[PDB]
Design a protein around this ligand. Structure first.
Ligand SMILES: [Ca+2]
Length: 276
DNA sequence: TCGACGGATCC
DNA sequence: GCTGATGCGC
DNA sequence: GGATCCGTCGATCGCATCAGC
């Protein structure tokens, strides 16, 4: 069936009002997405922090419109070391973070511009574009090694500060996270290896899947639809974009949104509300 | 994602 | 700047 | 032997590069 995001709950389980609004969006081509007026949508949504994945855009080709974006002035970008127009992530923030860093600290996994880490007063924000297992699972073996290094890195981080992980994690955790699970158990993003990796990521860091913690049995909630076969028209999709939270942060969780109607990509944006 | 393919295998 | 082909995706 | 059942296996869209001039 089709899906309507419920309204934004902007008070916490204790009634404290949300102080912090984080939007995450795989823009699948930053320049194409700006040409498709996504930046307008970002302006009307007005996040305190915007995380972008799959920018496919090197630092010096960044369009001018991003400078004229005065509520998200502190901007950080990561592109692959030697693969142009591939991958890429950015982190735009209203307030200046204490410390920004790139990658997870493992040479093998830090060459494709996928991870930005931004340290704030009371939490640490990681945004990531996870490597896709590949058509015909050509990179599924590399991906399990990423999963373990990423798990290890995030666990280390979360031991020092409450952690918010957001972005495209390239896996539908459970069968409820995609429209046709039975046909995709051998396609990238729904292999047993990928769903197990996600489960261990939740278990080992540990982290809670914010959306699923709030809406544990809501089906048809997806963040991605392939461009082909009018899949978004029919809501034949996958939930690949998450906010994963330190359990410490659950009493701060106000809501976790899926902005199904915002166009500009084959991913829609997701928005997180915290009382901090 | 969807389909046309097969090569199975049922009534 | 323009064509045409290739890489990469969930 | 003529219908179904179910595993492949290509071809769909979109962004971006690259080779060449
Ligand atoms: Ca490829």
């Amino acid at each position: 069936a089709l899906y309507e995001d419920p309204p934004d709950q902007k008070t916490s389980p204790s009634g404290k009002p949300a102080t912090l609004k984080i939007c995450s969006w795989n823009v699948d081509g930053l320049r194409a997405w700006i040409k498709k007026k996504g930046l307008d949508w970002v302006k009307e949504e007005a996040p305190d922090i915007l995380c972008l994945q799959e920018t496919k855009c090197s630092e010096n080709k960044l369009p001018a419109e991003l400078q004229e974006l005065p509520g998200l002035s502190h901007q950080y970008w990561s592109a692959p070391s030697d693969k142009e127009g591939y991958s890429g992530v950015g982190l735009l923030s209203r307030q200046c973070p204490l410390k920004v860093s790139y990658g997870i600290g493992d040479e093998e996994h830090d060459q494709e511009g996928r991870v930005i880490v931004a340290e704030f007063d009371s939490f640490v924000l990681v945004t990531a574009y996870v490597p896709n297992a590949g058509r015909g699972l050509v990179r599924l073996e590399y991906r399990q090694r990423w999963d373990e290094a990423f798990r290890k890195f995030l666990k280390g981080l979360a031991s020092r500060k409450p952690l918010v992980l957001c972005g495209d994690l390239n896996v539908a955790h459970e069968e409820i996270d995609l429209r046709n699970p039975k046909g995709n158990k051998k396609n990238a993003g729904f292999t047993p290896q990928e769903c197990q990796g996600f489960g261990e990521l939740l278990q080992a860091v540990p982290l809670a899947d914010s959306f699923r913690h709030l809406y544990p049995n809501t089906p048809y909630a997806y963040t991605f639809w392939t461009y082909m076969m009018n899949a978004r028209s029919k809501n034949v999709g996958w939930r690949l974009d998450y906010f994963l939270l330190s359990h410490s942060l659950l009493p701060a969780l106000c809501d976790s949104k899926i902005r199904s109607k915002a166009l500009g990509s084959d991913h829609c944006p997701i928005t997180l509300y915290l009382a901090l």
